[PDB]
Amino acid sequence: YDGPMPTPRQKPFQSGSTPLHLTHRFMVWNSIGIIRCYNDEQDNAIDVEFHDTSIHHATHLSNTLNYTIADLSHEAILLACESTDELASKLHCLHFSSWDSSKEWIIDLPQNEDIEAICLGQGWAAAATSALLLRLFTIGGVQKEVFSLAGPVVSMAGHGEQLFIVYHRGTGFDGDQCLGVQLLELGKKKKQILHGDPLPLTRKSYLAWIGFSAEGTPCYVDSEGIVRMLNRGLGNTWTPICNTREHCKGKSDHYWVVGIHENPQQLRCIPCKGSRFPPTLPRPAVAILSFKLPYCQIATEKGQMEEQFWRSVIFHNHLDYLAKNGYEYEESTKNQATKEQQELLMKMLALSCKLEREFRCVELADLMTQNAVNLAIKYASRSRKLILAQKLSELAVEK
Amino acid sequence: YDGPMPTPRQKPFQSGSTPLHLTHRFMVWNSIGIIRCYNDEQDNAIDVEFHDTSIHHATHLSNTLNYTIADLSHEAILLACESTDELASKLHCLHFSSWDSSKEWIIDLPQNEDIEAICLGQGWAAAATSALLLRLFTIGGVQKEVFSLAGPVVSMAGHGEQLFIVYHRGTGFDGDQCLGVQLLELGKKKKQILHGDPLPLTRKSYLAWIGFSAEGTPCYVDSEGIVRMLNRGLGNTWTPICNTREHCKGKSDHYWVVGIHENPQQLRCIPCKGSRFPPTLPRPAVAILSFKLPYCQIATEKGQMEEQFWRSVIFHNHLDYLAKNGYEYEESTKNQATKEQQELLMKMLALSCKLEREFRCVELADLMTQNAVNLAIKYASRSRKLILAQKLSELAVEK
Amino acid sequence: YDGPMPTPRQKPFQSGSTPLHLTHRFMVWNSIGIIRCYNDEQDNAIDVEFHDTSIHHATHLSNTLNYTIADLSHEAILLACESTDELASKLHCLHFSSWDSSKEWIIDLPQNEDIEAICLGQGWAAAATSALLLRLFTIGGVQKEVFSLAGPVVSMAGHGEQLFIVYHRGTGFDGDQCLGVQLLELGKKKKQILHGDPLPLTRKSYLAWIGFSAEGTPCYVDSEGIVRMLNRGLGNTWTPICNTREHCKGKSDHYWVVGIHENPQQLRCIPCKGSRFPPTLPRPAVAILSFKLPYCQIATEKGQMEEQFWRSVIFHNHLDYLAKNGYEYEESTKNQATKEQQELLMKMLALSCKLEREFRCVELADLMTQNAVNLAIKYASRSRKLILAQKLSELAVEK
């Protein structure tokens, strides 16, 4: 046969974990902690570590039921295993944060159904299954809801009241994966944000990591090391914010994501030399990288100011989202970010004056606050750019 | 060729009908009536029968034009045929409910355009054609507005102002059909609810039945006998509400669905043994099945109360939808359903309290009305679980 | 290989261009002007022509940087070329309307990223790239926000604050192209109208032309000459408005679109015989075709009035859209269209009345203004159609 080929589908995987064939492997490594599974033929056991054990004390448990999937939160540790010829698939919750005494519970699936991915959010847990069903639970194990997925699930993540799902949307071809995304908000009023929409990916690539920023923005990375974030402001589009391949010292090196922060701007990941993932031991060192958006002509300070400006704007979108959600936020941050953005716009405007691109100055001033346009009028007047000062005055009258 | 294989596409079909090659077949069986096709040496004719004899008298029509597709509503009978080498594809409406006297009309389609599916709604009719176009009509045959479909249509259903369409969304593989759903509201304001979104299916299944509950909720069933209903309370997701294979006492059993009622909770279907559908004769008898959400650990009273509670919740979504559309209902139904839901929550809360899962009690109380939380506070106080009574009081203060 | 075949994907193209290997060819021809590329081994140059040179003077440019894709607006000429072993892909804007000191700017893309499609809108420009990225620019060459494309782009168009993208949504089969569309608004509030939703197409067709009505409604045409327009009044569905094959007097004829107008109702296109597109020499001439919605029984006066009525309705939907977007509009034209529609409804009602389909008269009266209903009541009274007059009176009372 001479034609193009259907791509072999990516299997489901729990985000931030390493392959099952390893005796000692990571089940989940995130901003909360690290879960290591030690599955020797001698011993099948689990090691739970918090980056702060005041959350809950360092804990080790025998993996008697042979859990293979796990998740970690501020509230609870969630564990899951497949069905066997003897067992239903089981979901085991260790709710350490409870104020009631009985801090564990287990749920057994309907008989032929298997868990394939899980995730945790504020006071709730979710599990996706081989029935192409998604099951919702409270953190205390009340069954909340059940519904059908659009296709074979790939991975899941949870943050606050947000549930982020990725699944197979069709047949991919010639190395591409046909993947779709569902994003839901589970508030007093409940919304589906993304209705199985197509998920942007690099050519001949597969999904490598998903999750949220600590600020609660959906994010993901592909096998080409391209980090993409949900741009809520820009019509819920997907903006690339970093290309990790730039820093691979040898090209067979890779970066394995651990967490994301918008403020401080931090990408937390582990450098893996000659491997797409880290070994469990000797304990890898997490590396922290800054984001850098793929702006053109970035060798110019003009491009750098544009990149810095939009990077700043994007990373502050979570404050508006939180405000719209009625979640509390530090408005001083928004004032400061606005000021930084006005300073960047003013620097770009001043440079544009010196470049004689006064039309471009008005374009930059269109993005300014009214106070910054007043300052721009004063600067332009002092610079004897009176045509620009007039144009800016008309803009100020329009604002 | 060594690759996986594209699934052969499901051919379009009228819901609640039986296959064309049968000389005697059901053109449509719904909650209104039955339409039989007789292509016999005695007579090539179509026979219409109403379940409630008071609606209209039984009617017989000679099928000279060789109609092949049909539909039935409270208002009219709709018939359609393909083009021949000489005939247009024709749409024939017999609008018996009219107050005017000239109670029929026929419309001829353009050349090379064939009707592929039809359906009836309140005062309007819709027809999808091999031009990949959808045509709309008033019940009296004014042409309403035409638009284009995303792919080859599979089936359609109408209820009130709602139009529910399913079509081929792409190429499915290895036995999966690739189906998409489009849902429109044809009120004074016209809206599109589902934008060609993917339709959930059981693996390697195909669509078997499509329609609405009598209460006007979109619903469908696949070839694996899984009934799915639109979950308006959950961001317009698809929730399974029954698995007929539990009552497939033999694997050759099948349940040929005829209609759905949320109040009383009834699935109306015909049991078929050795065939996916019944023969025309001897006249089959309607069987009633109950709904059952596929909740986990359902042998437990805890799981049973959860399943009952959420099943009750889902079936009451139609009252909210009716209210959003300005349509009315007996509010005592809503009060009673709410009360039953409170009683189920109260029983689950009492069980959780006696299990000393007091955290789970507060999680259940989160779903209670304020009066039910007050009653839960009184129960907890009378049970002398004062920590729980305190937590419930905090919740009551919060609401 | 025994199974059905995945279709090869349609290559990207600029709308209103002609194929690249033609030494003398059209780069873009729209309602603003004509741009021609003349690529001799001795001379590679581009000719710019305006349909009104007061906008700017017709201009000849030496194509030393070897641009291959281009666009034209009221404000600027946009040019683009691919990278080489020595060059980035470059975007060159000739901003002829600028009042600042230079009417040009150039942007060089990141390494190994190539421009694949471009378009212009009101004060902004957009470029889609081989990185599956969408890059936005102001008309003066600020860099605006960047995001990821759903798949390989096919073509783009812009009008006002609207940006219209089409891309490969999946793998088509047996001659079909699987295409998806994204439609975004770039106002002070930014929105996504179509979430990468499927694009309707004629069977086995491919996309031939894309753009907007001069009135600002998205429209497109496939390789079968079927013109479709976005129906904002019908939940943003796609309505066909013309089959150009009816005017293929020879059926090797084709119509190559240049522009679209709702008011006056005009399809502006070039007739091409034995080719889907015109050569640059001898200088072609535009033909104007009228729209013709594919309504049934169009040989009848009834069908003609229905076609005219809906055609009139559709071509004035933009007035409401523009008003909601704060654009100014011809209220007089809205009154004119209202009058056309009342006259057509009155004629259809009178015809139905004389055909004694009195129920259909009431159906038509539902679409009338209250004044037209009162006039219809008086007509019915004078006709002594008192039952119909009563039904119409009850409808008038209902409004």
Question: To which residue do tokens 């893996």 refer?
Answer: A272
Contacts of C355 in chain B (CB under 8 A): 102
Structural contact between residues C269 and C258, judged by C-beta atoms closer than 8 angstroms:
yes
Side-chain-side CA neighbours of B95 within 13 Å: the count stands at 27
Question: Rounded CA gap, A254 and A256, in Å?
Answer: 7
What is the rounded distance in angstroms from the CA atom of residue B89 to the CA atom of residue B127? 11
CA gap A211, A235 in Å, rounded: 20
Chains that touch C (3 or more CB pairs under 8 A): A, B
Say if CB C278 and CB C254 are below 8 A apart: no
Compute the nearest-CA separation of B29 from chain A (Å): 28
Q: Considering only alpha carbons, which residue of chain A is nearest residue C188? A: A367
Q: Is B70 exposed, middle or buried (0-12, 13-18, 19+ CB in 10 A)?
A: buried
Residue C132's φ and ψ, nearest 5 degrees, are: 55, 45
Question: Could you please report the per-residue DSSP string of C38-80?
Answer: EE-SS-EEEEEEESSTTSS--EEEE-TT---EEEE-SS-EEEE
Residue C138, chain A, CB below 8 Å: the answer is yes
φ/ψ (deg, to 5) at A336: -60, -45
**Helices and strands per DSSP (H, E), number in chain B:** 6, 23
B384, exposed or middle or buried, with CB in 10 Å at 0-12, 13-18, 19+?
exposed
B216 contacts B226 by C-beta, under 8 angstroms? no
B148 to C237: CB separation less than 8 angstroms, yes or no: yes
**Within an 8 Å CB–CB cutoff, is residue A351 touching chain C?**
no
| Alpha carbon of residue B204 to chain centroid | 21
| 3-state DSSP of B159-218 | ECCEEEEEEECCCCECCCCCEEEEEEEECCCEEEEEEEEECCCCCCCCEEEEEEECCCCE
What is the length of chain A?
399
> Could you tell me which of B255, B205, B285, B297 has the C-alpha nearest to residue B16?
B255
B169: nearest Cα among B156, B144, B151, B186: B151
Distance CA A47, CA C384 (A): 91
Nearest CA in chain C to B96: C359
Residue A284: CA count within 13 A, CB half-sphere: 24
A-facing residues of C in 275-304 (CB < 8 A) are none
Shortest Cα distance, chain B CAs vs residue C235, angstroms: 5
B146 touches chain C (CB under 8 A): yes
The Cα C381–Cα C387 span in angstroms is: 9
Q: Using CA atoms, how far apart are residues A397 and A374, in angstroms rounded to an integer?
A: 10
Q: How many CB pairs under 8 A join B and C?
A: 111
Q: Is B313 at the interface with chain A, CB within 8 A?
A: no
Facing A200 at nearest CB: one of C132, C140, C142: C132
Confirm or reject contact between A234 and chain C (CB < 8 A).
Answer: yes
Q: Which residues of C315-331 are buried (b: 16+ CB within 10 A; e: fewer)?
A: bbbbbebbeeeeeebee
Phi and psi at C344, nearest 5°, equal -65, -40
Residue in A305, A227, A214 with CA at minimum distance from that of residue A263: A214
Q: Does C107 touch chain A (CB under 8 A)?
A: yes
At A81, list the tokens.
């295993």
User: From start to end of A273-384, where are the E strands?
Assistant: 287-289
Cα nearest neighbour of A195 on chain B? B197
In the block, tokens 């309505």 appear at: C239
Say which residue the tokens 């509230």 belong to.
A75
Walk across the sheet containing A24-29 and list its strands. A24-29, A33-39, A44-50, A59-62
Please indicate whether, in this complex, the C-beta atoms of A194 and C192 are within 8 angstroms of each other.
no
Confirm or reject contact between A236 and chain C (CB < 8 A): yes
DSSP classification of residue A173: B
Cα dihedral B130, B136, B138, B143, rounded to 10, equals -80
Residue of A121, A33, A27, A7 whose CA lies nearest to A75: A121
Please state how this structure was obtained.
cryo-EM
CB contact under 8 A, B359 and A147: no
Is B234's CB within 8 Å of A147's CB? yes
Q: Taking CB atoms and an 8 Å limit, are B231 and A149 in contact across chains? A: no
Placement of tokens 């809206």 in the chain:
B191
Tokens, residue C133:
């990225």
Strand partners of residue B230: B238
Measuring CA to CA, which residue among A186, C198, C172 is closest to residue B192?
C198
The answer to whether the Cβ–Cβ distance between A149 and B200 falls below 8 Å is yes
> CB distance C363–B140 less than 8 Å?
yes
Shortest CB distance from A195 goes to which of B178, B197, B200?
Answer: B197
Contact call for residues C92 and C76 (beta carbons, < 8 A) = no
Contact C110/A at CB under 8 A: yes
**Taking CA A394 as the corner, what is the angle to CA A389 and CA A399, rounded to the nearest 5 degrees?**
120
Which residues 6+ apart lie within 8 Å of A159 measured at CB?
A121, A211, A212, A216
Give the integer Cα–Cα distance in Å for C33 and C75: 12
Tokens 């009574």 -> residue: B389
- Any residues with CB less than 8 A from the CB of A168 and at least 6 apart, and which? A9, A10, A151, A152, A153, A154, A177, A178, A179, A180
Read off the tokens for A55.
């959350």
Smallest Cβ distance to B363: which of A132, A142, A190? A142
Q: Match 């002829």 to its residue by tokens.
A: C96
Among the partner residues A171, A173, A360, nearest to C140 by beta-carbon distance? A360
Q: Give the amino acid at A281.
A: L
β-sheet with B218-222: strand ranges across: B207-212, B218-222, B226-231, B237-243
The CA-based dihedral angle spanning residues B246, B252, B253, B258, taken in that order and rounded to the nearest 10 degrees: 120
- How far A371 CA lies from chain B's nearest CA (Å)? 41
- Backbone phi, psi, residue C42, to 5°: -85, -20
The minimum CA-CA distance between C399 and chain B, rounded to whole Å, is 12
B131 touches chain C (CB under 8 A): yes
Give the other-Cβ count within 10 Å of C378's Cβ.
Answer: 12
Give the helix ranges, DSSP H, for C147-219: none
CA distance B197 to B182: 7
Specify the length of chain B in residues: 399
Contact A20, A30 (CB under 8 A): no
Q: Which long-range contacts (CB under 8 A, 24 or more apart) does C55-61 make?
A: C55/C96, C56/C96, C56/C97
A322: how many CB neighbours lie within 10 A of its CB?
16
A3 touches chain C (CB under 8 A): yes
Nearest CA to A288 among A261, A250, A254, A310? Answer: A261
Nearest Cα residue to A143 out of C170, B304, C315: B304
Indicate if the alpha-carbon torsion angle A246, A249, A255, A261 is positive or negative. Answer: negative
CB–CB of B145/C294 below 8 Å? no
Q: Is A332 exposed, middle or buried (0-12, 13-18, 19+ CB in 10 A)?
A: exposed
Element spanning B258, H or E: strand B253-262
Given an 8 Å threshold on Cβ–Cβ distance, is C240 in contact with B195? Answer: no
Which chain A residues are Cβ-neighbours of C131 within 8 angstroms? 294
The C-alpha torsion from B152 through B155 and B158 to B161, rounded to 10°, is -20
User: What's the CA gap between A162 and A74, in Å, rounded?
Assistant: 15
Instruction: Determine if the peptide bond prior to B264 is cis (ω within 30°).
Output: yes
Closest CA to B30 of B81, B68, B73: B73
Cα-Cα-Cα-Cα torsion C322, C327, C328, C333, nearest 10 degrees, comes to -10
Residue of B nearest to A123 (CA): B363
User: Given the DSSP bridges, would you call strands A162-168 and A179-186 parallel, antiparallel or unpaired?
Assistant: antiparallel
Tell me the Ramachandran region of residue B217: left when phi exceeds 0, alpha when psi lies from -120 to 50, beta otherwise. Answer: beta
Q: What resolution in Å is listed for this PDB structure?
A: 3.4
- Kindly report the backbone phi and psi dihedral angles of residue A46, in degrees, each rounded to the nearest multiple of 5, phi listed first: -130, 140
Residue B148 contacts C, CB cutoff 8 Å: yes
Is C140 within 8 Å of A173 when comparing Cβ atoms?
A: no
What DSSP character marks residue C6? B
Q: Which of B110, B140, B149 is the closest to C357 by Cβ?
A: B140
Query: Between chains, do C195 and B195 touch, taking CB under 8 Å as contact?
Result: yes
Residues forming a β-bridge with A130 = none
For residue B266, count other CB atoms closer than 10 A to its CB. Answer: 17
- Contact between chains at C1 and A4 (C-beta distance less than 8 A): no
**CB < 8 Å to C196, chain B:** none
Element (DSSP H or E) covering residue B347? helix B331-354
Give the span between the Cα atoms of B362 and A310, in whole angstroms.
44
Q: Contact at 8 Å (CB) between C339 and B85?
A: no
Query: Coil, strand, or helix at residue C388?
Result: helix
Residue C235 phi/psi, 5-degree rounding, is 60, 35
Shortest Cα distance, chain A CAs vs residue B361, angstroms: 9
C240:B148 CB<8 A: yes
